[PDB]
Design a protein around this ligand. Structure first.
Ligand SMILES: O[C@H]1[C@H](O)[C@@H](O)[C@H](O)[C@@H](O)[C@H]1O
Ligand SMILES: O[C@H]1[C@H](O)[C@@H](O)[C@H](O)[C@@H](O)[C@H]1O
Ligand SMILES: O[C@H]1[C@H](O)[C@@H](O)[C@H](O)[C@@H](O)[C@H]1O
Ligand SMILES: [Ca+2]
Ligand SMILES: [Ca+2]
Ligand SMILES: [Ca+2]
Ligand SMILES: [Ca+2]
Ligand SMILES: [Ca+2]
Ligand SMILES: [Ca+2]
Ligand SMILES: [Ca+2]
Ligand SMILES: [Ca+2]
Ligand SMILES: [Ca+2]
Lengths: 150, 151, 151
């Protein structure tokens, strides 16, 4: 009796593994990118930084925080697909010239475009990622593609 | 004996699925879904008249948004606010004027009518819209409102 | 005693996972997907030329929509109708004019050609579109059509 029910449970789990794997592909198409244990997903619209940040946090995630070249490339895929530069999570709102993650931690990876960050006009504390994957500091009030990470 | 090996094998596979799925739930509901209790609301992101909206939801295996508590109403309001578009609810007094019912025919267990509503304005409001402030208003079923289904 | 109850507990967990997964699957497919048998169609919601469309689907781990039966065709037609945009299918006769094949090179097992089609109009129609009425027409691959992938 026990072997009969373990065999049934094995069939259930194998079915679930197959169905779940299929569903993951469906979900990520066309607005998500999985890299390592992280998933980026775009909302497909633009918002100013504060509104974008709230959308991600309320969804149970945070704004895209690429922490390696591989993460940056995956994010860049969404930016290229939508043809809209995106906000990253990181700001120097606390200490000018020192960019940090929302937790307050200093950057462990950067991909700044030449000459950046430059606090242009003395008022750029947010960060956008271009279709070329490079970063530029930009005014937080500008509207950029919303991309969150989970 | 070898069944012990198997049960321990399944425990590991189940743990992986639970964890992987937990992450995908959050991803999936961003930005057009809202979970509340065991219910999930999901917007199509566009507007339709009632009959068309109803059909979309039922064909998808769900039904138009049917908030049955203040908590559900607040969750739905989150999507309405996010989209900045009033939505249809499932409920109508199409069968008996003045008596609003769910698609099953059951009477309301919860309502959040704006003051003075429902008023059957012009003698022809049999559907219900939820505003960005979360209040309800009866409205002509012919009007186009945000499509939000529950699953 | 220990092993039988572990089976019982583990199966309650799997069945709760099955239920949650089923719910999240319905949510996922509303409004841009359709399931039919073991196949799932999902639209990107925009138009692209064939080569671009094909690449999007393959990069996503699927392929362009490839209806292999009347039931599959009807499922796909729902999305086309919902978007009101004709969609590319995966199949082409680029290799041998007049002989439409799937990406694997296999000849068609199902077709739903509109009257008069395929006609290779202008001498250069090697891709396939599906209309809102579910019928197919051969069309120039350079044209832009709704992107619908299957998984
Ligand atoms: O953030 C600024 C801004 O995008 C300017 O338009 C550009 O000329 C600067 O180089 C850049 O630092
Ligand atoms: O009850 C309300 C109210 O009468 C409004 O003034 C009218 O614009 C709406 O259509 C109606 O539903
Ligand atoms: O077969 C069709 C048909 O002849 C249409 O009139 C033409 O507009 C399309 O391009 C062609 O593919
Ligand atoms: Ca500053
Ligand atoms: Ca700055
Ligand atoms: Ca700058
Ligand atoms: Ca009436
Ligand atoms: Ca009425
Ligand atoms: Ca009214
Ligand atoms: Ca040809
Ligand atoms: Ca041809
Ligand atoms: Ca033709």
């Amino acid at each position: 009796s026990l072997r009969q029910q373990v065999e049934a449970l094995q069939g259930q789990v194998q079915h679930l593994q197959a169905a779940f794997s299929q569903y993951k592909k469906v979900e990520l198409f066309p607005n998500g990118q999985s890299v390592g244990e992280k998933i980026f997903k775009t909302a497909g619209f633009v918002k100013p930084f504060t509104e974008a940040q709230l959308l991600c946090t309320q969804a149970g995630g945070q704004l895209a925080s690429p922490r390696s070249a591989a993460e940056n490339a995956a994010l860049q895929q969404l930016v290229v697909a939508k043809n809209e530069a995106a906000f990253l999570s990181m700001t120097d709102s606390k200490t000018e010239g020192k960019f940090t993650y929302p937790t307050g931690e200093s950057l462990v990876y950067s991909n700044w475009a030449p000459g950046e960050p430059n606090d242009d006009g003395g008022s750029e504390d947010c960060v956008e990622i271009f279709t070329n994957g490079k970063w530029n500091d930009r005014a937080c009030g500008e509207k950029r593609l919303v991309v969150c990470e989970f």
